[PDB]
Design a protein around this ligand. Structure first.
Ligand code: HEM
Ligand code: HEM
Ligand code: NA
Ligand code: NA
Lengths: 306, 306
């Protein structure tokens, strides 16, 4: 298995993270492609340098810019963010050329690395968005509920997240989708505890999954636990973290997967619901401000250039 | 000594911090004064609740708003930020009604506390500025030099920072000045090491103070180490931390002192220099974007209301 996946795609959780969205200047693709190689490599190398603080990271590339940078070849299923909307439940698409996802248990080291990576890009791209993620309590979303529990574990993570020999040229790569969710915390926190629990489908403190028969059809976990046309579970590996500040704060939702339709099917099920009009009531409490599709290739793919 | 100083004024350093600047709505002083009491108290109480992560904090009150909130009485020496400027060396004044200074070795807890404090203010004030500070490496400024070394230590901190029986009514309070310094890091980091060291007056890595005779008259430490009309050292207790992000980043300079002219004399010496036109060359590398004067009273002063 010659291609090497970037280490931050499947990494276990961290106390802190940085999210950097760049858009490229006109006609710079000849110069960026090798510069992206250096950055990808550096990010990999930093895993070992900063092992002490579990550093890890990845560089991913926007769906709408792939063909300016990599015109000769393409991931089989790559496409733009799947915009959708019903009522107040809006999932907009806002694409960026490049995404740099950085993680560590030390914040000072991410500040340093970010500064460094920014200098690596020279005057070839513009920084468009920057946000900083943080672990909240014992891996909780700012809603006060534990986020992460039913994620793939150990080697299953690789199985779920990484492209394999279905697409030989891009094996080691992952399909990435990012939604910046701005929570309405004042509205949420006026809910009685039982309502909160009924919206997620788990108890808050102890984080105990409801029994099947007890899960409401409008609950987050009922809506995003799907099975394929053959009964098999349809999974993703999420890497999301709380983010923001008083002005604006919520979840930086990140999906990683060997196929892009897993996230889409889940999102459809959340916005549009089950078919008897049972949608995801969690969506009454937060708003997705962005929606971006990327591909994060293997290191080896990124490096074959200049 | 009945008045109790707020615990965050003299606190030892922390890994993280939040800085919140609020301006009050029209004619709300009757309602704010007791609400400020609750907030001050809460911040104190949180020192014990979150001892595990060395939590501490203070609420301070702008020079230009003191008399709307506390018309009956005033700190003896309280006045606006001492604006000054020569050449490109600008120290502007931008005052805010209230400052909430929060600190902790855990960032998640500060996010929570900030959210909470914001809700305490209701619709009586507007949030105007928020920034987050962080320890960089072994307590270094983003210049790569250790910041803090010659600060007062142990009980001397209290001696330097806190008003005493010179002003009985406000004993336990401190005079606070805040400058948001935006560093030009690209410019700084093109300096050869010896130049950097010559600008600060200490060696970078080992942080060794230059000998007197070797300190250049334009070096930061030469300029801000002053003696009074009787030879005695003129001190302040700084509580500054690195802050910001790629868009903008530098030092959140914070001075705390029992008298406000200490910081002023230092700042004058930095901007205007020694008198043979030897100013502080550090100022060629960073720009002070804000300049705010506050008073942080004792808890007991703040609490005597409604
Ligand atoms: C405001 C944004 C969101 C929040 C606060 C949130 C929160 C949660 C929480 C608390 C859980 C239960 C703990 C766990 O099993 O991980 C969960 C489960 C899950 N979420 Fe979300 N989520 C959000 C958005 C999304 C989105 C947009 C998707 C997909 C497009 C998604 C997919 C999933 C999946 C696949 C599970 C595991 C369910 C299972 O199989 O048991 N989440 N989420
Ligand atoms: C860009 C903003 C600033 C930076 C990066 C900076 C950095 C430093 C550094 C690296 C030191 C030496 C280590 C130490 O003894 O603490 C120092 C010392 C000091 N600084 Fe600054 N400083 C800044 C602004 C200021 C300002 C605005 C003042 C006063 C208005 C000030 C007052 C002092 C004092 C009193 C000392 C101790 C000097 C001594 O007695 O040895 N600093 N500063
Ligand atoms: Na490098
Ligand atoms: Na409270």
């Amino acid at each position: 298995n010659m291609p090497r996946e970037q280490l931050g795609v499947c990494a276990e959780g961290n106390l802190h993270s940085v999210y950097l969205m760049f858009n490229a200047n006109d006609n710079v693709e000849s110069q960026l492609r090798p510069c992206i190689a250096n950055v990808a490599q550096y990010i990999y190398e930093l895993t070992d340098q900063y092992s002490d603080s579990a550093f890890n990271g990845f560089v991913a590339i926007g769906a709408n810019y792939w063909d300016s940078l990599y015109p000769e070849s393409r991931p089989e299923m790559l496409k733009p963010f799947p915009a959708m909307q019903e009522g107040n439940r809006e999932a907009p698409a806002i694409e960026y050329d490049l995404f740099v996802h950085l993680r560590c248990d030390r914040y000072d080291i991410l500040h340093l690395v970010a500064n460094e990576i920014s200098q690596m890009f020279e005057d070839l791209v513009e920084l468009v968005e920057e946000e900083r993620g943080f672990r909240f309590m014992d891996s909780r979303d700012l809603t006060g509920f534990v986020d992460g529990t039913e994620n793939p574990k150990g080697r299953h993570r690789q199985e779920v997240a990484l492209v394999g020999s279905e697409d030989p040229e891009f094996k080691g790569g992952s399909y990435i989708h990012v939604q910046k969710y701005a929570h309405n915390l004042s509205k949420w926190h006026r809910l009685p505890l039982k309502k909160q629990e009924d919206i997620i489908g788990r108890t808050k403190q102890d984080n105990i999954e409801y029994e099947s028969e007890d899960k409401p059809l409008t609950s987050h976990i009922k809506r995003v636990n799907l099975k394929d046309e053959n009964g098999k579970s349809i999974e993703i590996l999420r890497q999301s973290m709380p983010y923001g500040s008083l002005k604006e704060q919520g979840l930086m939702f990140i999906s990683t997967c060997r196929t892009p339709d897993h996230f889409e099917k889940m999102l459809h099920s959340m916005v549009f619901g089950d078919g008897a009009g049972n949608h995801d009531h969690l969506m009454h409490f937060t708003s997705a401000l962005t929606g971006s599709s990327f591909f994060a290739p293997s290191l080896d793919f990124l490096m074959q250039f200049d």
